[PDB]
Design a binder for this molecule. Structure first.
Ligand SMILES: [Mg+2]
Ligand SMILES: [Zn+2]
Ligand SMILES: [Zn+2]
Ligand SMILES: [Zn+2]
Lengths: 59, 98, 141, 47, 162, 610, 98, 57, 115
RNA sequence: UAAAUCGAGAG
DNA sequence: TCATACGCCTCTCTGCTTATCGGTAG
DNA sequence: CTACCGATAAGCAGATCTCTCGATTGCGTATGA
């Protein structure tokens, strides 16, 4: 697999890493699922369901 | 259609930095990897120097040079480029989305 | 490689020009067949006009500037017809030079314009000469 | 005279810009005369 | 973590191919064709594993067009009805660095290999005796001197010693 | 080709170049030493010309990429030759360049100020500043020869900056036909002036020229009558490859700038110094085994000719390497004059024969020596030169798929824009129609009909190129496959595609016909398709005979079947027969009825016809 | 790292773009352009691109595209290329057939 | 040697035989039709050297 | 149309080499459908319908210890006309290694033929 | 199933 | 006596390119 | 007087559309049997 139907031709990264504030780490995981179902799966994904609560609370 | 599409249409792999067509080849995965295509020129020997290192059929270790793209070319162009390399002449193909 | 570009100038695929105008006129040879058959065009005027549909060919066209320039050039060469060729100091170049023949109605070759004027002078035909001239210029375009 | 012209072409490092139809045919690119003398763009009404 | 956050946003410029099926919804087509498969995947160019995307922009081929108009132009390759274009997206990538300390949990243990799970998402590889005698728990600090990237998911291997 | 497999990257431009011996020794998969192809058992000998790492050979999986015979692209190799040899491609250039050189000062035998004149002229003209190039010569006005040069450098740089600044020439330079003409004229004249005189006006110590014999030999004589007398005041031999390379490299190192501006026409990033290792191949390149595969009779096996030539090169190289070891051992102690003389003579003629071997490997004509023979083996240059060469035979025109050829029989019952396709054609040629919400019924019917009943389908190409052929399936299998034609695809990567049915050439398609020689445009039109289920020959109306210049003299004309909608629409509108009514030669018509319809009209339009 | 590569190409691209107010090419849609647009539109429909023109049981994508062009709803934009590299951007809607 | 001569047509000799051509001295007597067969025993060839020169006198 | 062919199994038989392949059938598990259009010996019958993909003669190859069959090499169906068992002139009484098969094809006048 | 040369040739 | 693997065994047109022999400067 | 520049004459280099059938494939030689 992994043809042009599913992968970009070039993945050049512009500007630079621009998040070293260490304080604005929120607002993405609480909003990514908002723009997702309101269904990406290849065969099985489970780390997305246990990667958000680490910064906030406990598993 | 009458010269390329239905005669010798080949989706070969081409490196942007190398600019050559046949200098690339498929890496052999070790365990649970993906056999991508990498250069035999961009990569330098581990002696002369994982995600950074890919191996070949002879068991040698090659590091770097894992940039390339697929372009639609006739196979006869590849044969001509090989024959030119027999003359010592090298052709560099400039890829648009560099 | 040499092919006509979007400026109606033929030039090699490199870009090196060969001529600015395709033969000085840029009319397709396959369509040059009945642009001299004045009698046939006049006889079939109504069918030709229905085919051309001049009504839909106004909002994307300009007529007055090219027509005025062509008339000025025509009267200039009429005043300047009989004299040695090396003395013909051109003040107004042929209309094809500036106005795009596919964008300005009335921009036609000097040979075609001369033949059309000679025909309209010699032959006096209910359709008027003005509508016939407009249709012939649309045919040339 | 493929040998004659190739020698001059490589000796002065002559670079072909893929303009002539024959070069496009050899490389295998859409020709530049006629239907391939322009490009076509798709208009999409995104938000 | 140990006074380190990472998860650095990185705008990217990518050359996507848009199917003619999504010709009336180009942005959703682009995300579902390229960006959605890029999630939960370790991309070397981005640096690490990607947790999502945000901020779709179409770098259309019309230079005279305003940078905010609702219609955009997509270049169609000659031999295919598929459309190619550039795009701008914001990628959120968790970036490990060699020579640092990371906090992770312990899930699977064996006699030879010791499994460490950084935020229960970084797969890697029966209480016994420790230096202090405490039974092995899920909380510990390790080193990232060895990284394996030949499997399905990247792994972190190291030792307590520096 | 496949419509459902697009590609983004395309080759914008191609630039030629030379191969440095470092990079090819860096990229190669294996060397080549033993001049033997196959052993007694037929297994590929390790390190042989069919080495297992140079591409898969027969069943042996290639030991560089680990793929099968049809999956291995075929990697390149290299032979580490121990002696540089003159390139027959660049032999004339080398001979001309070193002919006009001085041995002592290692500069050109022309003056050192014309050197900078031509360097600046070429540098400035490379940017398309033609008028400035000719205006530079107006800066004319021993130790004064350096003050003049500083003026030329300022004038050159100022003009180029000015031309770049105002948009007259982008930094990449402007290479057009006229600048190419001026480059050729100036460079040829400058070389001719180099070859003109014989006394070196840079140090005074002039040097003897070199002669030629064939295209592998160089001769000189350092001793003359008067040229001897003068060089003391100014204080048929053999020329060896290593020392001629040495003097070449010395000259090039001296004149780097001029060699750069004379060995380059695109003035951008020409940093790479033009060295002397551009006409000597210390490392030769062997094509991959996939490209060097031998022929195969029903039983006989014949050796590849290029492989045989490479084996001969290996034989001479191994003989030379063996003899040099004999040279070294006999070098331990001074040996009899006869022994050292004979071994050095053997080295001399071995170098001569390896030069002839490389010359024959490249070009067949340059080979010397033939009394009876059987056939002169063609070289690599012979494979790309004549009409039978690779260019005119496999790139300007190739054999095509989805195309037929048969005799044409006339038929005044087709509307002068169709063709009569016999059913034997209509059961072979196919079009890859993709399934969809409106083509489902017709394509399902074609699939149910199958490859034997026209109209029908032969292959059902899935989204992921899994061509399911219908040749060997029964009616119930075909019916089930048709009923499973339009279903959602589980794979997301293929969820944007749908299956393609290789349906037979229906009645609505369009083909291209051609009656060789295709002298002019009308000899290749596009006719519509009409499937007459009676005959076995193509059926063509009478109006097309005049245009094709065809006959019905048992003429056979081709029939191409375009496979993508671009080609279909392009032939249906631009190349269709109706639009070709008038030939572009003079505007006269080229169609119309010919022989009996004319007399029928004469009889029917007369007055007696009531 | 990448901006200097990108900004230079967009400036060049915007340089060649001829403004809409001063495009002096043929207003009519040429035969080549008609053929290319019809073929590309037919390819899109074959690849399941949405269509806003009703289909009367037609099965030929080329005929569907011809109907679209006759009714003038093709969602395609041409790009006329001048020899230097300058390009003008006409639209099918403002183009005149024949 | 004679069998080879008749089978291949090519002539090998060390005297030239005062003949311009070297090959094409025997033809396979085709049995396609009796007309062809009888016509085989009657033609005269000017020589294979005359089949290339551009003059037509 | 009368077309003949000669299938030779002594082409690779070197001077004095023992006979490598004979005409006929071996003891292997060859399909019974081969018995159609092939006689008890290696030669086929006379006047049988043979098309592309249809065996002509069956020869026993001891080198592979198997019986192999040849195949027709022409699209047009033909009828076997003659099967000439041609012998050898040498003193050695070798088995059948050379045979000649003659084919007949119905060349009925079809359209496109030249009169 | 190769590859080259010669003859018969067809348009 | 004698067989297969090595070793060679004479009726056409356009240029371009270089050698040799006349004239002129110093 | 002698070096530089052209002006012939000889040699060098290269030219004078597709396809199908059939036929054919080297002497010399030199040592191990
Ligand atoms: Mg004919
Ligand atoms: Zn590379
Ligand atoms: Zn390989
Ligand atoms: Zn010197």
């Amino acid at each position: 697999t992994a043809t042009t139907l599913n992968t970009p031709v070039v993945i050049h990264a512009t500007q630079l890493p621009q998040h070293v504030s260490t304080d604005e780490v929120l607002q993405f995981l609480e909003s990514f699922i908002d723009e997702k179902e309101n269904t990406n799966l290849s065969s099985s994904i489970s780390q997305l369901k246990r990667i958000q609560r680490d910064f906030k609370g406990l598993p | 259609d009458r010269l390329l599409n239905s005669s010798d249409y080949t989706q070969a792999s081409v490196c942007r930095e190398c600019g050559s067509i046949l200098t690339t080849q498929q890496s052999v995965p070790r365990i649970g990897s993906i056999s991508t295509v990498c250069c035999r020129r961009c990569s330098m020997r581990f002696e002369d120097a994982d995600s950074q290192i890919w191996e070949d059929g002879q068991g040698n270790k090659f590091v770097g040079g894992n940039e390339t793209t697929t372009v639609a070319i006739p196979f006869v162009l590849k044969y001509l480029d090989s024959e030119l390399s027999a003359m010592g002449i090298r052709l560099r193909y400039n890829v648009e989305p560099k | 490689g040499v092919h006509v570009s979007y400026d109606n100038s033929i030039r090699d695929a490199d870009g090196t020009l060969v001529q600015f105008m395709y033969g000085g006129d840029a009319i397709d040879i396959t369509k040059e067949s009945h642009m001299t058959q004045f009698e046939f065009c006049l006889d079939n005027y109504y069918a030709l006009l229905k085919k051309y549909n001049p009504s839909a060919l106004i909002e994307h066209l300009d007529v007055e500037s090219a027509l005025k320039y062509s008339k000025k050039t025509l009267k200039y060469r009429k005043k300047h017809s009989k004299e040695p060729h090396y003395k013909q100091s051109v003040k107004y170049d042929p209309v094809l030079a500036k106005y795009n023949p596919a964008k300005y109605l009335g921009s036609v070759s000097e040979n075609f314009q001369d033949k059309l004027e000679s025909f309209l002078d010699k032959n006096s035909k209910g359709v008027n000469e003005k509508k016939f001239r407009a249709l012939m210029q649309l045919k040339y375009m | 005279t493929t040998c004659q012209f190739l020698t001059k072409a490589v000796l002065d490092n002559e670079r072909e810009q893929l303009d002539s139809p024959s070069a496009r045919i050899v490389v295998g690119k859409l020709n530049n005369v006629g239907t391939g003398s322009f490009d076509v763009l798709a208009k999409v009404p995104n938000a | 973590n140990g006074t380190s956050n990472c998860i650095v946003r990185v705008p990217i410029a990518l050359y996507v191919s848009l199917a003619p099926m999504y010709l009336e919804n180009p942005l959703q087509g682009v995300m579902k064709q390229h960006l959605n498969p890029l999630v939960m995947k370790y991309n070397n160019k981005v640096g690490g594993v990607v947790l999502g995307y945000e901020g779709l922009k179409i770098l259309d081929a019309d230079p005279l067009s305003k940078e905010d108009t609702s219609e955009k132009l997509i270049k169609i390759t000659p031999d295919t009805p598929f459309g190619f274009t550039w795009c701008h997206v914001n990628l959120y990538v968790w970036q490990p660095q060699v020579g640092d300390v990371l906090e992770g949990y312990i899930f699977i243990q064996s006699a030879s290999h010791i499994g460490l799970l950084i935020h229960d998402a970084f797969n890697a590889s029966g209480h016994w005796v420790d230096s202090n005698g405490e039974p092995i728990d899920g909380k510990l600090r390790f080193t990232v001197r060895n990284v394996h990237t030949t499997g399905r998911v990247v792994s972190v291997d190291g030792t307590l010693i520096s | 080709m496949d419509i459902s497999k697009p590609v983004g990257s395309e080759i914008t431009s191609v630039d030629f170049g030379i191969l440095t011996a470092k990079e090819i020794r860096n990229l190669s998969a294996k060397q080549i030493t033993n001049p033997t192809v196959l052993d007694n058992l037929g297994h590929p000998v390790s390190g042989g010309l069919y080495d297992l790492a140079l591409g898969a050979f027969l069943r042996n999986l290639c030991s560089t990429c680990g793929l099968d015979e049809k999956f291995c692209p075929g990697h390149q190799g290299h032979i580490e030759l121990p002696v540089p040899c003159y390139n027959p491609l660049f032999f004339n250039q080398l001979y001309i360049y070193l002919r006009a050189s001085c041995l002592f000062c290692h500069h050109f035998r022309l003056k050192s100020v014309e050197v900078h004149r031509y360097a600046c002229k070429l540098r400035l003209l490379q940017y398309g500043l033609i008028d400035e190039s000719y205006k530079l010569d107006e800066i004319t006005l021993s130790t004064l020869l350096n003050e003049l040069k500083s003026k030329r450098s300022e004038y050159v740089d100022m003009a180029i900056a000015k031309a770049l600044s105002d948009g007259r020439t982008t930094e990449r330079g402007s290479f057009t036909a006229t600048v190419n003409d001026e480059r050729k004229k100036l460079v040829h004249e400058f070389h001719k002036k180099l070859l003109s005189r014989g006394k070196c006006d840079n140090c005074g110590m002039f040097s003897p020229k070199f002669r030629k014999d064939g295209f592998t030999k160089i001769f000189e004589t350092a001793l003359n009558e008067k040229q001897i007398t003068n060089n003391r005041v100014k204080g048929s031999t053999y020329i060896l490859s290593t020392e001629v390379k040495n003097i070449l490299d010395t000259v090039f190192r001296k004149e780097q700038c001029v060699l750069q501006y004379v060995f380059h026409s695109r003035p951008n990033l020409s940093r790479k110094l033009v060295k002397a290792d551009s006409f000597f191949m210390d490392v030769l390149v062997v094509p991959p085994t996939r490209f060097r595969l031998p022929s195969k009779l029903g039983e006989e096996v014949h050796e590849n000719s290029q492989n045989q030539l490479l084996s001969k090169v290996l034989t001479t190289s191994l003989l030379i390497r063996d003899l040099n070891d004999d040279l070294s051992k006999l070098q331990k102690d001074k040996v009899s004059l006869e022994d050292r003389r004979v071994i050095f003579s053997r080295l001399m003629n071995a170098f001569v024969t390896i030069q002839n071997d490389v010359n024959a490997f490249i070009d067949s004509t340059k080979a010397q020596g033939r009394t009876s023979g059987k056939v002169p083996i063609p070289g690599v240059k012979q494979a790309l030169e004549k009409k039978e060469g690779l260019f005119r035979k496999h790139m300007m025109g190739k054999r095509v798929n989805y195309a037929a050829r048969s005799v044409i029989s006339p038929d005044p019952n087709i509307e002068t824009n169709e063709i009569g396709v016999p059913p034997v054609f209509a059961v072979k040629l196919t079009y890859p129609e993709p399934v969809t919400a409106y083509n489902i019924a017709e394509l399902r019917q074609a699939v149910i009909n199958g490859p034997d009943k026209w109209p029908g389908a032969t292959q059902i190409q899935n989204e992921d190129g899994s061509l399911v052929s219908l040749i060997g399936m029964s009616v119930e299998q075909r019916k089930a496959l048709a009923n499973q034609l339009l279903t959602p695809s589980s794979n997301v990567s293929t969820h944007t595609l749908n299956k393609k049915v290789y349906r037979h050439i229906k009645n609505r398609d369009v083909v291209l016909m051609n009656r060789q020689p295709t002298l002019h445009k009308a000899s290749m039109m596009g006719h519509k398709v009409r499937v007459l289920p009676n005959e076995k020959t193509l059926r063509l109306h009478y109006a097309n005979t005049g245009a094709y210049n065809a006959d019905f003299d048992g003429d056979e004309m081709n029939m191409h079947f375009p496979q993508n909608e671009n080609a279909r629409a392009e032939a249906l509108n631009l190349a269709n027969t109706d639009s070709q009514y008038l030939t572009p030669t003079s505007g006269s018509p080229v169609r119309g009825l010919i022989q009996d319809h004319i007399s029928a009209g004469v009889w029917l339009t007369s007055k007696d016809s009531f | 790292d990448f901006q200097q590569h990108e900004q230079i190409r967009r400036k060049t691209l915007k340089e060649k773009a001829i403004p809409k107010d001063q495009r002096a090419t043929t207003p009519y849609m040429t035969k080549y352009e008609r053929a290319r647009i019809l073929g590309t539109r037919a390819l899109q429909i074959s690849m399941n691109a949405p269509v806003f023109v009703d289909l009367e049981g037609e099965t030929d994508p080329l005929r569907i595209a011809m109907k679209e062009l006759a009714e003038k709803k093709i969602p395609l934009v041409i790009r006329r290329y001048l020899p230097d590299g300058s390009f003008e951007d006409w639209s099918v809607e403002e183009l005149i057939v024949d | 040697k004679m069998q080879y001569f008749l089978s291949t047509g090519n002539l090998v000799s060390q005297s030239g035989l005062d003949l311009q051509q070297v090959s094409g001295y025997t033809v396979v007597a085709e049995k396609i039709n009796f007309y062809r067969f009888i016509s085989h025993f009657r033609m005269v060839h000017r020589g294979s050297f005359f089949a290339q020169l551009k003059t037509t006198t | 149309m009368y077309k003949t062919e000669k299938v030779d199994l002594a082409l690779n038989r070197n001077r004095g080499d023992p006979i490598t392949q004979h005409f006929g059938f071996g003891n292997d598990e060859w399909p019974k459908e081969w018995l159609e259009k092939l006689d008890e010996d290696g030669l086929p019958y006379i006047g049988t319908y043979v098309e592309e993909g249809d065996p002509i003669c069956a020869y026993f190859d001891d080198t592979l210890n198997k019986t192999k069959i040849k195949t027709y090499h022409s699209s047009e169906p033909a009828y076997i006309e003659e099967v000439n068992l041609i012998g050898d002139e040498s003193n050695k009484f070798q088995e059948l290694q050379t045979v000649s098969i003659k084919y007949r094809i119905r060349r009925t006048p079809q359209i496109g033929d030249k009169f």
